[PDB]
Amino acid sequence: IVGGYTCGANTVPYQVSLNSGYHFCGGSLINSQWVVSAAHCYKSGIQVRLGEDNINVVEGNEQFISASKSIVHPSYNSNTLNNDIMLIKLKSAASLNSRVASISLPTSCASAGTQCLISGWGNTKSSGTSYPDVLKCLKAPILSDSSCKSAYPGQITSNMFCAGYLEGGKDSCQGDSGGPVVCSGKLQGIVSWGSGCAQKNKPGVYTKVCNYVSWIKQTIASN
Ligand SMILES: N=C(N)c1ccsc1
Numbered sequence: 018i019v020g021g022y023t024c025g026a027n028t029v030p031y032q033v034s035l036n037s038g039y040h041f042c043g044g045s046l047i048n049s050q051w052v053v054s055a056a057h058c059y060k061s062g063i064q065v066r067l068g069e070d071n072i073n074v075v076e077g078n079e080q081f082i083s084a085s086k087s088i089v090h091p092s093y094n095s096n097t098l099n100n101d102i103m104l105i106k107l108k109s110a111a112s113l114n115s116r117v118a119s120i121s122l123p124t125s126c127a128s129a130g131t132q133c134l135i136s137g138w139g140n141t142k143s144s145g146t147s148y149p150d151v152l153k154c155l156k157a158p159i160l161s162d163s164s165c166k167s168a169y170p171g172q173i174t175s176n177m178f179c180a181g182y183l184e185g186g187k188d189s190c191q192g193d194s195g196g197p198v199v200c201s202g203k204l205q206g207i208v209s210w211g212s213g214c215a216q217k218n219k220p221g222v223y224t225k226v227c228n229y230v231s232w233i234k235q236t237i238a239s240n
Pocket residue numbers: 188189190191192193194208209210211212213214215220221222
């Protein structure tokens with residue numbers, strides 16, 4: 018997260034870290050047994066880390082649970098990142114508490130201009146590299162479809178939306194992928210891609226979760 022702020026320990030209790038020997042992506046807890054992340058975060062041997070603040074220090078509220086299965090969206094296209102969504106099932110149910118909690122799925126899509134909370138442990142610099150250890154947060158509005166498509170001609174589908182600031186300076190970044198965009202208490206986005214980070218006229222691009230609620234609910238119910 019570039020241009021954000023330190024969330025505070027466990028203030029984003031649905032935020033998870035995906036670990037394969039190291040943190041590589043975020044995710045969002047949607048019930049005690051299931052996490053939703055980006056398809057481009059897929060790999061085998063994922064451990065889901067819940068209750069994290071400093072990802073390099075055991076602080077006492079963590080739960081570490083291996084994934085038992087991953088389900089990449091049937092229409093995911095790794096070339097274009099269309100349908101950049103996956104589900105991860107936990108081998109054992111998380112113990113839900115005030116610091117490990119699920120986030121509700123949308124009942125409808127969110128409007129342009131709605132303010133959202135974007136979070137993660139990704140790079141905090143728009144030129145260069147610095148990774149923060151504690152969770153970072155950014156408040157940012159959903160941008161109009163036309164400004165999104167103007168920023169990325171030929172690359173935006175109906176399964177993507179943009180959020181952030183066209184002036185630059187505030188954005189998600191590498192290492193945030195798979196993590197949450199929460200608006201009005203609902204998981205509306207997944208950190209997906211962008212051009213650089215926090216650059217002018219290049220806002221972040223997010224998977225549009227509201228298009229996937231039926232797929233999520235049916236897939237979980239059958240797996
Ligand atoms: N929002 C961005 N610039 C981004 C997201 C994943 S990698 C870069």
